[PDB]
């Protein structure tokens, strides 16, 4: 399911639609412009890892859970060439640009 999400996050980087960071993710969520959300499973502080799906359910937004954050961060383009490797724990794709159909039928 990760390989069918990598291309849609890549075209999100192409079309600049995705919002990296928790605050930009929430800003995409409450403006009702959001399309889907991606949450890292490695979250030490627990009060925000439960808030993201609460906001997603309040705004009827689908969610994908990924095990890693630094791998998610280098997929969403938080690295430069890679010397510096920093990652994000949550990112909301606001709008897209084949496997996006696979993801949206996996939601159903």
């Amino acid at each position: 399911v990760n390989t069918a999400l990598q291309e849609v996050l890549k075209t999100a980087l192409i079309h600049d639609g995705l919002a990296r960071g928790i605050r930009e993710a929430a800003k995409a969520l409450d403006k009702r412009q959001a399309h889907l959300c991606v949450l890292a499973s490695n979250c030490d502080e627990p009060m925000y890892v439960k808030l993201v799906e609460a906001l997603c359910a309040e705004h009827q937004i689908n969610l994908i859970k990924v095990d890693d954050n630094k791998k998610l961060g280098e997929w969403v383009g938080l690295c430069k060439i890679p010397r510096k490797v920093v990652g994000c724990s949550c990112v909301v794709v606001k709008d897209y640009g084949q496997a996006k159909d696979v993801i949206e039928e996996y939601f159903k």
């Binding site: 928790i22 605050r23 800003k27 009702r32 009060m47 439960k50 609460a54 906001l55 309040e58």
Partner: protein, 57 residues
């Protein structure tokens, strides 16, 4: 008397205070450019919007 440059207070998880569990713990800016996420600073006597700079008491 050397002038030290100001350093921003790096507060841990500044986002994790305006919500519960759902609702908005702080109210919303009623402006045209500001709203649906532009949260309202609530100081001990007064209220601040960080983009359009409205003064609410």
């Amino acid at each position: 008397p050397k002038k030290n440059k100001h350093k921003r207070k790096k507060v841990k998880l500044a986002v994790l205070k305006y919500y519960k569990v759902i609702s908005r713990l702080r109210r919303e800016c009623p402006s045209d450019e500001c709203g649906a996420g532009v949260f309202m600073a609530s100081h001990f006597d007064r209220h601040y919007c960080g983009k359009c700079c409205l003064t609410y008491c």
